[PDB]
Design a protein around this ligand. Structure first.
Ligand SMILES: C=CCO[C@]1(C(=O)O)C[C@@H](O[C@]2(C(=O)O)C[C@@H](O)[C@@H](O)[C@@H]([C@H](O)CO[C@]3(C(=O)O)C[C@@H](O)[C@@H](O)[C@@H]([C@H](O)CO)O3)O2)[C@@H](O)[C@@H]([C@H](O)CO)O1
Ligand code: NAG
Ligand code: K
Lengths: 219, 219
């Protein structure tokens, strides 16, 4: 009912520009300012700038040299453009009405995850993680899948087609080189495995990859 | 710029506890127009921040009575009187009085539980990965409390710092614990120059580290 809908790329090449459109419904751009904010693990939340009802703007001076905010009152669009992105501009970007006085239109857009990278689309390797031959047994048994060298995010991982929903930790991806890696662990009865099959199902839609990998015990 | 310092960084609590979050500004934050634009946001995982408190003390649309703000000058506080499950997340303070607008570092509101040691599991590289030229040794440190934890890799007696990447989960919905992976990545060639591989976890629960390991001689 009040909505700020964001549209634009989730991937930007180093040195290229990021454009986002914020489509506003539920209040008038000719009465209320719209702000732009980003969130990154390096800097947390950072306010980038604002376009006021009259079209005047304020920018964070650390960005002023490469940032532009404009709008189209008739279409109810606010436009964000930042130039010359570098790896550390990887962040979630938001349009938002904040810093309110009289009104109750304080709402944020759903957020646009922007990754700055020259990486090419690349499917994962899926390596099974089984205990070493030596030794090593006690209840329960923890197994895993290593999902290595993919781009872009995301991948999904389920176990035995989702039967082993419980006892699973699938960890956040980290960057090594210019590609992503993560792992998923699963813990299941020592009596069950290997009498009972355990297979991880990995999906990477961006490469139309679907892989099941059975966890064989090693000898 | 105006500096916004939140404390604590992290706050554990039981469902029904009262909580108090602090935000301190490096200067006075009264806008030229006379208003004090101190705002409080709560963010859940994978959601946009949502406004709780505006102009210091005013509750936003649909914010429960149990939430309240106060403060003046350089000192502001948010207090919750009876924390419910829906209140858990990361709290942020914001000043929109002086360009550039700025956020605090965040305060995480997480659910309290009894201590638990990490369940540590070490996994040698799969034969598949070795064929591909790489060797990732994976260690999982699963289901531990509190969050703080230290992981250390040793190869043939020597601490190994380079090639180690770590990834952490958020607090588990079902049991309220955390889980971590530590992954040591080597080339195949360097993996096969060494025999003993050790993952060592040091945690509040034990004065002795938890040590899992394997030997390649046995692989
Ligand atoms: C056409 C109007 C002239 O005003 C502006 C413009 O809209 O382009 C903005 C104006 O900036 C200031 C000011 O008075 O100098 C300071 C800025 O920090 C803000 O406070 C703005 C507005 O007051 C903000 O408006 C809103 C808001 O967007 O939150 C909405 C309003 O309907 C109202 O609710 C107010 C609130 O009551 C008062 O804050 O909040 O004002 C300045 O940039 C002038 C410029 O000098 C023209 O050359 O342009
Ligand atoms: C961000 O990235 C570039 C990398 O070239 C660097 O010059 C700059 O110091 C960094 N600054 C911040 C604030 O991240
Ligand atoms: K108007």
């Amino acid at each position: 009912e009040v909505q700020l809908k964001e549209s634009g790329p989730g991937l930007v090449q180093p040195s290229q520009s990021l454009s986002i459109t914020c489509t506003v419904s539920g209040f008038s751009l000719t009465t209320y300012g719209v702000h732009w904010v980003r969130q990154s693990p390096g800097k947390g939340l950072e306010w980038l700038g604002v376009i006021w009802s009259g079209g005047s703007t304020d920018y964070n001076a650390a960005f002023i040299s490469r940032l532009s905010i404009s709008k189209d009152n008739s279409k109810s669009h606010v436009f964000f453009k930042m130039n010359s992105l570098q790896a550390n501009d990887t962040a979630i970007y938001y349009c938002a009405r904040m810093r309110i006085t009289t009104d109750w239109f304080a709402y944020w857009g759903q957020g646009t995850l922007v990754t700055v990278s020259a990486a090419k689309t690349t499917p994962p390797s899926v390596y099974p993680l089984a205990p070493g031959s030596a030794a090593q047994t006690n209840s329960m048994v923890t197994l895993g899948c290593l999902v290595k060298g993919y781009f872009p995010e995301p991948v999904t991982v389920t176990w035995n087609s989702g039967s082993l929903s419980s006892g699973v930790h699938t960890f956040p991806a980290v960057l090594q080189s210019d590609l992503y890696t993560l792992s998923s662990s699963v813990t299941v009865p020592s009596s069950t495995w290997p009498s009972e099959t355990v297979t991880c199902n990995v999906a990477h839609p961006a490469s139309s990859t679907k892989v099941d990998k059975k966890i064989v015990p090693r000898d | 710029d105006i500096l916004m310092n939140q404390t604590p960084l992290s706050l554990p609590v039981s469902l029904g506890d009262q909580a108090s979050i602090s935000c301190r500004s490096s200067q006075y934050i009264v806008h030229r127009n006379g208003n004090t634009y101190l705002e409080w946001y709560l963010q859940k995982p994978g959601q946009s921040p949502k406004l709780l408190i505006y102009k210091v003390s005013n509750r936003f649309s649909g914010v429960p009575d149990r939430f309240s703000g106060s403060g003046s000058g350089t000192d502001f506080t948010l207090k919750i009187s009876r924390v419910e499950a829906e209140d858990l997340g990361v709290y942020y303070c914001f000043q929109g009085s002086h360009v550039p607008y700025t956020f605090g570092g965040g305060t995480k509101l997480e659910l309290k539980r009894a201590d638990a040691a990490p369940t540590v599991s070490i996994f040698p590289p799969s034969s598949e990965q070795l064929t591909s030229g790489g060797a990732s040794v994976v260690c999982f440190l699963n289901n531990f409390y509190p969050k703080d934890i230290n992981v250390k890799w040793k190869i043939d007696g020597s601490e190994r710092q380079n090639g180690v990447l770590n990834s952490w989960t958020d607090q588990d919905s079902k049991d309220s614990t955390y889980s971590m992976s530590s992954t040591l990545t080597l080339t195949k060639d360097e993996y096969e120059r060494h025999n003993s591989y050790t993952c060592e976890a040091t945690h509040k629960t034990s004065t002795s580290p938890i040590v899992k390991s394997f030997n390649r001689n046995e692989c």
